[PDB]
Amino acid sequence: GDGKYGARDADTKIWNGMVGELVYGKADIAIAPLTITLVREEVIDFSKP
Amino acid sequence: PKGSSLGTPVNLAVLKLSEQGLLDKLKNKWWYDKGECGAKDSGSKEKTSALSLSNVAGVFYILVGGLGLAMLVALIEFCYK
Amino acid sequence: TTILESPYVMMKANHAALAGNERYEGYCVDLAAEIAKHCGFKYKLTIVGDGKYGARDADTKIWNGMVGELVYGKADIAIAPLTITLVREEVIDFSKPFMSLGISIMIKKPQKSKPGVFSFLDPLAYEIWMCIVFAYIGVSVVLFLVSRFSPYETNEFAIFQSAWFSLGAFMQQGADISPRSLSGRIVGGVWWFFTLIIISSYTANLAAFLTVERMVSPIESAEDLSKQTEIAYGTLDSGSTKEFFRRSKIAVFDKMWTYMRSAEPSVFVRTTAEGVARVRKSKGKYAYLLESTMNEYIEQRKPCDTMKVGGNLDSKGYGIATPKGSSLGTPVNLAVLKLSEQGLLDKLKNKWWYDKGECGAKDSGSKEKT
Amino acid sequence: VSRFSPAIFQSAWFSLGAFMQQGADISPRSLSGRIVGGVWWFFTLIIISSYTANLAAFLTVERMVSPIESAEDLSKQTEIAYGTLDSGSTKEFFRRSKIAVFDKMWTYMRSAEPSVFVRTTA
Numbered sequence: 001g002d003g004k005y006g007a008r009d010a011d012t013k014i015w016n017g018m019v020g021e022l023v024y025g026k027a028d029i030a031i032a033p034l035t036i037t038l039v040r041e042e043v044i045d046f047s048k049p
Numbered sequence: 050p051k052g053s054s055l056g057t058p059v060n061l062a063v064l065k066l067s068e069q070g071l072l073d074k075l076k077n078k079w080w081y082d083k084g085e086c087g088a089k090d091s092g093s094k095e096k097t098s099a100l101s102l103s104n105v106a107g108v109f110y111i112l113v114g115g116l117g118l119a120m121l122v123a124l125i126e127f128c129y130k
Numbered sequence: 131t132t133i134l135e136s137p138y139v140m141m142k143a144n145h146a147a148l149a150g151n152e153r154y155e156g157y158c159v160d161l162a163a164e165i166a167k168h169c170g171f172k173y174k175l176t177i178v179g180d181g182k183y184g185a186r187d188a189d190t191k192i193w194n195g196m197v198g199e200l201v202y203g204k205a206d207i208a209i210a211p212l213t214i215t216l217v218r219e220e221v222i223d224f225s226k227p228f229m230s231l232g233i234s235i236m237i238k239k240p241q242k243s244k245p246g247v248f249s250f251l252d253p254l255a256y257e258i259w260m261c262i263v264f265a266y267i268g269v270s271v272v273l274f275l276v277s278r279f280s281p282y283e284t285n286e287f288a289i290f291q292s293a294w295f296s297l298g299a300f301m302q303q304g305a306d307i308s309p310r311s312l313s314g315r316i317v318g319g320v321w322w323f324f325t326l327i328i329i330s331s332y333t334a335n336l337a338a339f340l341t342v343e344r345m346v347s348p349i350e351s352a353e354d355l356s357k358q359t360e361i362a363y364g365t366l367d368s369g370s371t372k373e374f375f376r377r378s379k380i381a382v383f384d385k386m387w388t389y390m391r392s393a394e395p396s397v398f399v400r401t402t403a404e405g406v407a408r409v410r411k412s413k414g415k416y417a418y419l420l421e422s423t424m425n426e427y428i429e430q431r432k433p434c435d436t437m438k439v440g441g442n443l444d445s446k447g448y449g450i451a452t453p454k455g456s457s458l459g460t461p462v463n464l465a466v467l468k469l470s471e472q473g474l475l476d477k478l479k480n481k482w483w484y485d486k487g488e489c490g491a492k493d494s495g496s497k498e499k500t
Numbered sequence: 501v502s503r504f505s506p507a508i509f510q511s512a513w514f515s516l517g518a519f520m521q522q523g524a525d526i527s528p529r530s531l532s533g534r535i536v537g538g539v540w541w542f543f544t545l546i547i548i549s550s551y552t553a554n555l556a557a558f559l560t561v562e563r564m565v566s567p568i569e570s571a572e573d574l575s576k577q578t579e580i581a582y583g584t585l586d587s588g589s590t591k592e593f594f595r596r597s598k599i600a601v602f603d604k605m606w607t608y609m610r611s612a613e614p615s616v617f618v619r620t621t622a
């Protein structure tokens with residue numbers, strides 16, 4: 001959506017981007033250059049780099 | 050997604066593609082093969098080890114020009130009987 | 131469980147004194163202490179059996195090493211530099227990689243002093259030295275014509291004698307000419323200025339390289355390393371480094387692999403120390419391919435004559451191996467990322483590679499160019 | 501290459517005038533003497549050029565030394581050692597310092613062989 005990366009908002013605290021689409025079940029997988037970070041490993045799982 | 054069926058198979062497939070060499074092959078395919086600058090860019094064997102030819106060619110040109118002017122002078126000298 | 135290898139896990143100077151966890155020091159010991167701080171658990175450091183890495187046998191098909199100790203429940207976790215591979219992910223779980231690596235080239239540090247007859251002409255060029263004689267003969271041929279003196283008036287002609295006079299300009303400052311000559315005055319006038327600029331540039335450039343001695347002569351590229359046979363290059367007798375060149379799809383690594391397979395003498399060595407010794411004894415004529423983690427450490431140790439040239443070739447990494455279905459898997463998987471984002475992993479890397487490295491920066495400035 | 505038709509003083513006095521000046525022209529003017537003096541002038545030219553160039557190299561590497569009035573640069577060099585006292589406030593000050601300069605100095609003094617610390621000030 002609108003070219004958003006896996007990022008969690010600060011005010012509304014809503015996950016937007018590929019991680020957001022995976023959290024709310026809108027998508028099944030995200031084969032994209034997504035950096036593995038601790039903030040995203042908590043909500044969605046990551047494969048080996 | 051956490052608890053999805055595709056997690057482990059993709060986790061293993063990434064390692065399978067990296068150990069086979071397909072990931073590096075795709076990297077070289079879409080980065081260097083399709084790159085407009087295929088070979089090395091602006092890279093010489095070594096960055097000015099000595100002196101360049103264009104650097105002395107000007108002195109050589111002023112030498113040739115002086116020799117030509119001296120030939121002209123000799124041409125007007127022998128004609129004077 | 132972890133393997134005793136330099137410098138990841140090393141025994142202290144007083145290993146016999148005291149007991150428990152103080153007997154070991156290194157990178158993985160600080161990493162284990164930090165994991166126990168960010169996860170909270172009592173940990174006991176144990177050495178792997180007879181120093182075996184994570185490898186599955188071919189005949190008996192028995193897992194030996196750290197991976198084996200986790201499979202049969204002999205150990206609970208393996209904080210050790212274990213490479214993440216597909217064959218090991220099937221049996222035991224892996225945490226995110228805490229350090230990336232790749233196969234690199236190690237060569238001896240090149241010497242700068244190069245005395246000899248081949249270096250006196252280097253300050254100018256291969257072409258300028260061959261052009262100064264062309265300018266000299268171009269001046270001699272003009273001296274053949276500009277040698278015209280006043281005779282009452284189809285000439286006396288100049289043979290043999292003209293070349294004699296012409297040869298004089300190369301020795302003396304130039305000109306030579308004939309007395310009371312109008313055109314030779316300017317022939318030698320431009321010649322003297324030309325040779326003056328030439329000698330001035332020669333002396334100036336010679337001074338420039340007696341103060342700035344850099345002399346970086348390695349190609350620094352694997353593809354040109356395969357395109358030359360003077361400096362040999364080899365890997366290990368057995369291991370993933372050799373197998374990577376074996377099953378490689380890129381034509382560069384295939385050329386390197388054919389070169390190493392049809393190598394006389396054989397470029398492969400049994401141990402890593404044999405490759406390091408061959409690099410240190412060949413005086414820059416041998417190269418050794420090995421993982422970058424060991425290449426950098428050998429470069430950071432005495433006698434500092436080894437150097438890691440170029441970059442990595444493949445993308446692999448070390449990760450903490452956890453047993454399948456263990457409680458510590460996910461907390462360690464998250465703690466690794468937490469330590470990487472804080473910067474403690476890179477801080478330990480700089481601590482145990484460069485800070486404690488025998489090869490210091492060396493005194494700033496200084497005078498070693500006599 | 502001179503008159504040698506069989507002690508000769510003629511060819512013993514001409515020799516030094518070509519070593520000094522530039523060329524090889526005396527009373528005789530022979531081409532063979534030109535090629536004797538032809539390589540000599542180039543040889544001595546290379547010699548004087550290299551002498552002047554190296555002299556510039558030692559007038560350039562003599563005034564590029566750093567005296568260093570700043571402690572930070574004193575820590576960046578290891579030929580000239582620097583130390584404090586075995587016990588006192590100076591050593592504890594280098595111990596509990598938050599600036600990376602004094603921390604580098606403290607690590608240098610802590611991992612010093614031979615020991616840079618002394619018992620007394622004298």
Ligand SMILES: O=c1[nH]c2cc(C(F)(F)F)c(N3CCOCC3)cc2n(CP(=O)(O)O)c1=O
Pocket residue numbers: 135183184211212213366368369370371402420421423424
């Ligand atoms: O998983 C593996 N991890 C490894 C880790 C290391 C080290 F760098 F020490 F950590 C080394 N060495 C490199 C330098 O020489 C001494 C041992 C070998 C490893 N091997 C064997 P390979 O098959 O030759 O790669 C593995 O299999």
Ligand SMILES: O=c1[nH]c2cc(C(F)(F)F)c(N3CCOCC3)cc2n(CP(=O)(O)O)c1=O
Pocket residue numbers: 585587588589590621
């Ligand atoms: O309050 C303090 N005032 C101090 C005053 C002086 C002096 F300069 F002589 F006045 C000295 N010396 C400097 C040269 O070495 C001989 C004695 C030490 C002092 N110390 C000990 P510190 O713990 O090493 O600083 C103090 O504690």
Ligand SMILES: CNC(=O)N1N=C(c2ccc(N)cc2)c2cc3c(cc2C[C@H]1C)OCO3
Pocket residue numbers: 098099242243244245249250251252253254336339340343546550
């Ligand atoms: C003791 N000599 C020495 O250390 N070198 N040789 C000189 C050199 C000095 C004098 C003369 N006459 C010729 C060469 C040289 C020439 C160069 C150059 C670098 C040097 C420095 C080293 C190789 O880079 C390009 O050219």
